[PDB]
Design a protein around this ligand. Structure first.
Ligand code: SD4
Lengths: 293, 271
C-alpha cells in the first residue's frame, strides 16, 4: 500500500527520511524523490564519505542523473561538471526545456542559466586517490556495499502516482565523457504510472545493454510481481553475460521495483546489494536475493 | 522459410544506404559490417551555437553496443561508435571525451560546418538514418546516425545514440530502429518496446503497430495532440519477416532482400 518509497543503498536509506516527510504529508512523488536525493547531495557528512565525489580518469567529477514523473515527463543530464545538485538540474531540463537530455558543457551552461552555482566537487582525498590510481591506470570498476555512489529512488505517493530519480558520479576513473545507465530512461530508471517503476544500480554498461528498468517494468506489465520481474530481468542479464563470453563475477546488477499497488521487490546478480524501503511501518534496509550463488 | 539476407532502413534515402549494405550482405558478409557501411554512406544543421554535433549508435548480434553523442569534428560517428563498442570498456561516450577517443583511434579531425550551413545558422539567429539487417548466417545488427541538431540547445541528445530508444537488437528475437521526434522515442523506450513485443509473440508488423498504439495512448494521457508527435519503427525478426508502423503518414522505408531493394509505406495510426 501507500505512500511508499524505495531506494538503492545506504544513501537511499538516508534519502528516504526526507522523501518520507514529503510523502507522509501528502506530497507529490516527484517532489519527494527530488527532495530525498537533495538531502544527500547537500549533506556534507555524506559528501565527506564520497557521495557524488568520484572523478573520471581526467580527474573530473562528472554526474549522470535523471528523473521521471507519473506521466512520462523526463529530464536528464549526463557528464555534468561543477554542479552539486544534478537531480534538480534534470528536473529543470524536464520542466523548462523541450528536451529530455543535455550533456557535457551544454548541461553545465543550462545549469548556470537556471541559477545553479559552480563548485568544486573534488575533495583532496579523492584527488589524492586519483593521482595514485593514475600510476597504473588499471580500470577495474566495482559496485558493492563498500564501493557505490547511486541513489535510484522510486516512490508511490498518496494519490497513487509513481515517480523516480537516479543519479551517480560513478564509475571512478571512467573515460572522460563516459555515460552510464543512471541518466538513460529505461536503463537506470523507468516509471509507467499504469504498471510500476524500477531503478537500478551496478555496472551501467550492462544495464544499458539490456534496457534493464524498462524490461523490469514490462515484466510487471506481463503479470510478474515486482520481485519476480526484478529476478527475471537479472536472469536475462545472466544469460547475456554468458552469451558474451564474460564472467558473471565481474558484473553486479541490482534492480528494485514498485508496482501500482505499492507492492515492492528487488533482486541482483550478486550478494552485496541492499535497498531501503520506507512505508507506514518505518524505514528499513533490506537485502534481496541474488543469482550468483 | 527464412528470408535472408535482408536489410531495412528509414526514409527514402534508405534506398541508397541499402545498396551499400547489400554489397556486404550479398557476399555473405556480417550484418554488423553491412549496417556500418550502410549508414557511413549517409555520413559521407548545427546546434544554436553554430556547432555541428553528431550522435550514433551500433548494436551487433551478441549484445555488444557502442554509442557517441554530441561529438564534434568527426565525419563518421557510426564508426567511432563501433570503436567504443570494440575498443573500450564503455558503451557510450559524449562530448569532448568522444572526440578525444575518436582522435586516439586515428579518426581525422575535420571541420563539419559547411560554408552555407554557417550562413544559414547566422540567418536563423536573426529570425538521420536507422538501419537493421539480417545476414546470411542468420544474425542481426543495427546502426543509426544523426547530424541535424536543428538549432537545438548545445548538448541536447535525441534518441539516435540511446540504446532501446533509437535502436535495439536482440539476436534471439529481432531488431528495431525508430524514426521521428527523439524526445518521444526516448521517453517511451520505443525500440526496446518493439522488440519485447516480438518476444511476446507478435510479428514485426504487429509489434511496430502495437508499440505505436501504446505510444498514442501515452501521448493522449500527456494532453498532447497527436498531430504534433511523430514516432515510427521498422522491425525485423530472426526469420526475415519485417514491418513498419507510425503515428502519422508520410514516412517511408527501404527494404532490400533477394527480391531487390524497394521502398515501402507502412501503416499509420492517425487517420
Ligand atoms: N550504475 C552506475 C554505477 C553504480 O551503480 N554505482 O553505484 C554506473 O554505471 O555509472
Amino acid at each position: 500500500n501507500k505512500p511508499i518509497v524505495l531506494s538503492t543503498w545506504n544513501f537511499g536509506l538516508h534519502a528516504n527520511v526526507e522523501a518520507w516527510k514529503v510523502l507522509s504529508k501528502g506530497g507529490k512523488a516527484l517532489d519527494a524523490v527530488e527532495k530525498g536525493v537533495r538531502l544527500v547531495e547537500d549533506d556534507p557528512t555524506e559528501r565527506s564519505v564520497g557521495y557524488g565525489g568520484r572523478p573520471d580518469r581526467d580527474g573530473r567529477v562528472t554526474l549522470d542523473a535523471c528523473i521521471m514523473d507519473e506521466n512520462y515527463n523526463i529530464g536528464s543530464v549526463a557528464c555534468m561538471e561543477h554542479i552539486k545538485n544534478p537531480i534538480s538540474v534534470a528536473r529543470a531540463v524536464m520542466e523548462k526545456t523541450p528536451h529530455v537530455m543535455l550533456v557535457g558543457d551544454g548541461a553545465l551552461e543550462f545549469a548556470l542559466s537556471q541559477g545553479f552555482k559552480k563548485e568544486n566537487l573534488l575533495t583532496a582525498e579523492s584527488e589524492k586517490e586519483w593521482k595514485e590510481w593514475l600510476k597504473t591506470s588499471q580500470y577495474k570498476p566495482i559496485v558493492n556495499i563498500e564501493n557505490h555512489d547511486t541513489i535510484g529512488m522510486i516512490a508511490l505517493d498518496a494519490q497513487g502516482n509513481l515517480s523516480g530519480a537516479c543519479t551517480t558520479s560513478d564509475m571512478a576513473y571512467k573515460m572522460h565523457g563516459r555515460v552510464g545507465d543512471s541518466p538513460i530512461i529505461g536503463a537506470g530508471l523507468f516509471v509507467d504510472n499504469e504498471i510500476g517503476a524500477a531503478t537500478a544500480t551496478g555496472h551501467g554498461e550492462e544495464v544499458i545493454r539490456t534496457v534493464g528498468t524498462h524490461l523490469v517494468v514490462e515484466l510487471m506489465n506481463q503479470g510478474r510481481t515486482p520481485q519476480q520481474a526484478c529476478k527475471e530481468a537479472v536472469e536475462r542479464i545472466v544469460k547475456i553475460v554468458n552469451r558474451r563470453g564474460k564472467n558473471l563475477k565481474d558484473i553486479q546488477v541490482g534492480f528494485i521495483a514498485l508496482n501500482k499497488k505499492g507492492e515492492y521487490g528487488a533482486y541482483c546478480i550478486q550478494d552485496g546489494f541492499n535497498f531501503a524501503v520506507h512505508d507506514q511501518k518505518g524505514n528499513r534496509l533490506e537485502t534481496p536475493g541474488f543469482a550468483l550463488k
